[PDB]
Amino acid sequence: SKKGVGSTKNGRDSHAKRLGAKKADGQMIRTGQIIYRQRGTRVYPGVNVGLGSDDTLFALSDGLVKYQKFGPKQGKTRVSVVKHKL
Amino acid sequence: NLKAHYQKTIAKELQKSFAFSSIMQVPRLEKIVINMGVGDAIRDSKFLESALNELHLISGQKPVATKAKNAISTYKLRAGQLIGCKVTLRGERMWAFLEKLIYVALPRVRDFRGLSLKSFDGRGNYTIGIKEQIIFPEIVYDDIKRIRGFDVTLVTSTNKDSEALALLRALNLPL
Amino acid sequence: FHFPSQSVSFKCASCSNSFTIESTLKQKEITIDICGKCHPFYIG
Amino acid sequence: MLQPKRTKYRKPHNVSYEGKAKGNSYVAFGEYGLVATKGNWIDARAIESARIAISKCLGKTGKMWIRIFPHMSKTKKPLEVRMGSGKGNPEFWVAVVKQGTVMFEVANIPESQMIKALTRAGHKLPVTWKILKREE
Amino acid sequence: MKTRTEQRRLRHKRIVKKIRATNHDNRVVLMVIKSLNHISVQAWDFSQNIVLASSSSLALKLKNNAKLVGQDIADKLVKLKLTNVVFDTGGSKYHGRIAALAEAARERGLNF
Amino acid sequence: AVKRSTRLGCNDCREINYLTFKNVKKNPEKLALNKFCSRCRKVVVHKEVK
RNA sequence: UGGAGGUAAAGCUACUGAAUGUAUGAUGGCGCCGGCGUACUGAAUACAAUUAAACUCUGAAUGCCAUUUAUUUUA
RNA sequence: CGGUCGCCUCCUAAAAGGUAACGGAGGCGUACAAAGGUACCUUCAGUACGGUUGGAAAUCGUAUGUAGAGUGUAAUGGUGU
RNA sequence: UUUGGUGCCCAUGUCGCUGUGGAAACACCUGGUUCCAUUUCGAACCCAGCAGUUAAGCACAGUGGAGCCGAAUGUAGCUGCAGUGAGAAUAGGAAAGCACCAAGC
Structure with a gap:
């Protein structure tokens, strides 16, 4: 009765890349620090934002973070860092 | 020369045939292309x-x-290896080649009925696709594995087909 | 670039009308004994 | 037994078959439809047996139509095996019938023989049924 | 195919998009246009979509290559005291009368 | 393992100062580069040495 | 207060597969003087209904993130 | 006994993240001195027709199409000048 | 306001069809004399200019053909039979605008 599948098929698994929304609209950000990490481009660089070509979208200036729709059918979300009032 | 005959008489005749108020709407000729390719063999044999x-x-x-837009090798075409050549001729040499084609050596086969x-x-x-290239006078000898004609394909600025018929009939092309 | 082109007098016993505008300069006295006047398709 | 030709995978999830119907509640071609009061699973052999039974007693002018199709695979490991060690093999095909789902629709033949035949065919189904009239 | 005129607009769009994605500095641009029989330039501003100045054949220009198109707007620009702009190659290459325009802009006190 | 990474040397220093990825199955030529040297503090032609 | 989102539900001429009946017929076969009635197979052009964890042209609630505001706090 | 032991992609995974089994699919122990950078030019796969050897499309020209094109590599995301 | 350039937002902005204009301009166009160029072709790019052009791109009138968008009634699922309320379908609209510049004004 104890006799089962030997040489079982793929049961392997990778790790989990800790990405997502590290920041959100409503928190002041220091320059240089990360905002969002993503595999691909589901968020696009708008104004005052640095794009490192390792799937990196970080803040390039000071201010407050906002998210706006864009694209054909609001499929794209562009991150913006609006500057503080002067 | 025949360009000075064409653009002085046949253009006017065509524009009076189909009464038009535009000189650039009549069937004219501005570009021709001649292609070449060897699908029969890839081996460097002439x-x-x-x-x-x-x-x-x-x-x-x-x-x-x-090079080919795809990679089809059921008749031995791999590893890139571009085939053939192309000339998209324009300007005065266009009409020089036209005159060489029409009124030099095409009348060499009795039943040349065209298309x-x-x-x-x-x-x-x-389009005119012929089987012989030695049919022309300006040909060399013992420089070909097997005689093969050159396909000529001419396009114009007129989308309509009746004007293409008028253009072909104006230069006395075979029926 | 490319070898220049020119025209030499065209000869034909069935044409008697020279077709000499621009063929090439590499040859001399282009001549063909059959033309369109004897050819029914190239006649009116 | 209408076996699928090709399938992307081999051992998927079965179904979450509770809740209302995803469709098939409407009657399209037949004059009498056979609806179900709840959902369950239907195996392939039962469908073929019911179809041949309903067609054998059917006349020569009426027409019947099936609204379901087995699209779920199932695993049944052989006897005396322990719990665990991978997944088993496919043994049959299962069609999913949610609540308020119509399975058969028939038309173009007198009604009394049709209600009798639909009863005799639905007796072969695991789920208790109900006759439903042609929708205009 | 294309209209042979939309090509220059496509070049303009792609170049301005690349620049505005890359130009983190805030400088106004000296846009250029080379039509069939005329040329026309505009000192434009981005981040506001407004125009600072323009010089065209419909503006002060005689029958027309010409060098009378470059130094006219540099004095207006220095009157607005910018003197540090970004240049646009337009739908043409940096050649011909465009080079004369660029040199006339450079010489008068503009740093691009 | 499959050794594919090689060194690079400064001809004006005869030291080891660079590590390149140059397999030997398709590149039979030596890499004559122009690399920056922190001892010469400038750009110098660099040859192959290992 | 707004967003980050593809989850149940629904959708399959909006894809990928699967897949049901109506409608016309491609390319082959068959009889035939350049064309054929095609008893045949039957690309899809439109119509009506379906199915999915590795289908998504769409699309919630709860929940998570910070500030606006009030309350308890020395955590 | 069998297999597995490290890493990478997806689903399981329940709309932030993570979240299991001897759960389901797969792969990797790499290549390129240019497939890198810059400037510039430029952009689908197919469909249909036309035609020399050439059928089912080989090669091309033209309308066509809205990514079924490409992306060194298993998959996802992404990218239509 | 006539038209050219023109940015924002990206098929309620478009695809496609029929007609009317281009004075000044914008595109065609005469050509490669020269800067320059082509995997070769003044095709493309670039140079000095108009004999003609409304035919073409652009606009102005109509066209719901395509595509797109889409209310009200109710509707599964949802948090505790009460809020919550999509997708599908449908009335139905839609021939885009918002800004800036220099003339004809």
């Missing part, structure tokens, strides 16, 4: 150099290479 020789001695510009039936895609096109 190829890629014989095409250069024949196109230099028949046309007014050197051959230009291009006036089923040669239109619908946007003002014409």
Whole structure:
């Protein structure tokens, strides 16, 4: 009765890349620090934002973070860092 | 010369035939292309150099290479290896080649009837595919594995097909 | 670039009308004994 | 037994078959439809047996139509095996019938023989049924 | 195919998009246009979509290559005291009368 | 393992100062580069040495 | 207060597969003087209904993130 | 006994993240001195027709199409000048 | 306001069809004399200019053909039979605008 599948098929698994929304609209950000990490481009660089070509979208200036729709059918979300009032 | 005859008399005759108020709407000719390719063999057997020789001695510009848009090898086509050559001729050499084609040596086969039936895609096109190249006078000897004609495909600025018929009939093309 | 082209007098016993505008300069006295006047398709 | 030709995978999830119907509640071609009061699973052999039974007693002018199709695979490991060690093999095909789902629709033949035949065919189904009239 | 005129607009669009994605500095641009029989330039501003100045054949220009198109707007620009702008190659290459325009802009006190 | 990474040397220093990825199955020529040296503090032609 | 989102539900002429009946017929076969009635197979052009964890042209609630505001706090 | 032991992609995974089994699919122990950078030019796969050896499309020209094109590599995301 | 350039937002902005204009301009166009160029072709790019052009791109009138968008009634699922309320379908609209510049004004 104890006799089962030997040489079982793929049961392997990778790790989990800790990405997502590290920041959100409503928190002041220091320059240089990360905002969002993503595999691909589901968020696009708008104004005052640095794009490192390792799937990196970080803040390039000071201010407050906002998210706006864009694209054909609001499929794209562009991150913006609006500057503080002067 | 025949350009000074054409653009002085036949253009006016065509524009009076179909009463038009536009001089650039009449069936005219501004560009022709002649292609070449060897699908029968890829092996360097009087190829890629014989095409250069024949196109230099028949046309007014050197051959230009291009590779296939896909990779189909059921008849041995791999590893890139561009085939054939192309000349998209323009300017005065266009009409020089036209005069060489029409009124020099095409009258060499008794039943040369051309192709006036089923040669239109619908946007003002014409094609002539012949089997012999030695049919021309300006040919060399012992520089070819097997004689093969050059397909000429001419396009114009008129999308309509009736004007293409008028253009072909104005230069006395076979029916 | 490319070898220049020119025209030499065209000769034909069935044409008697020279077709000499621009063929090439590499040859001399282009001549063909059959033309379109004797050819029914190239006649009116 | 209408076996699928090709399938992307081999051992998927079965179904979450509770809740209302995803469709098939409408009657399209037949004059009498056979609806179900709840959902369960239907195996392939039962469908073929019911179809041949309903067609054998059917006349020569009426027409019948099936609204379901087995699209779920199932695993049944052989006997005496322990719990665990991978997944088993496919043994049959299962069609999913949610609540308020119509299975058969028939038309173009007198009504009394049709209600009798639909009863005799639905007796072969695991789920208690109900006759439903042609929708205009 | 294309209209042979939309090509220059496509070049303009792609170049301005690349620049505005890359130009983190805030400088106004000296846009250029080379039509068939005329040329026309505009000192434009981005981040506001407004125009600072323009010089065209419809503006002060005689029958027309010409060098009378470059130094006219540099004095207006220095009157607005910018003197540090970004240049646009337009739908043409940096050649011909465009080079004369660029040199006339450079010489008068503009740093691009 | 499959050794494919090689060194690079400064001809004006005869030291080891660079590590390149140059397999030997398709590149039979030596890499004559122009690399920056922190001892010469400038750009110098660099040859192959290992 | 707004967003980050593809989850149940629904959708399959909006894809990928699967897949049901109506409608016309491609390319082959068959009889035939350049064309054929095609008893045949039957690309899809439109119509009506379906199915999915590795289908998504769409699309919630709860929940998570910070500030606006009030309350308890020395955590 | 069998297999597995490290890493990478997806689903399981329940709309932030993570979240299991001897759960389901797969792969990797790499290549390129240019497939890198810059400037510039430029952009689908197919469909249909036309035609020399050439059928089912080889090669091309033209309308066509809205990514079924490409992306060194298993998959996802992404990218239509 | 006539039209050219023109940015924002990206098929309620478009695809496609029929007609009317281009004075000044914008595109065609005469050509490669030269800067320059082509995997070769003044095709493309670039140079000095108009004999003609409304035919073409652009606009102005109509066209719901395509595509797109889409209310009200109710509707599964949802948090505790009460809020919550999509997708599908449908009335139905839609021939885009918002800004800036220099003339004809």
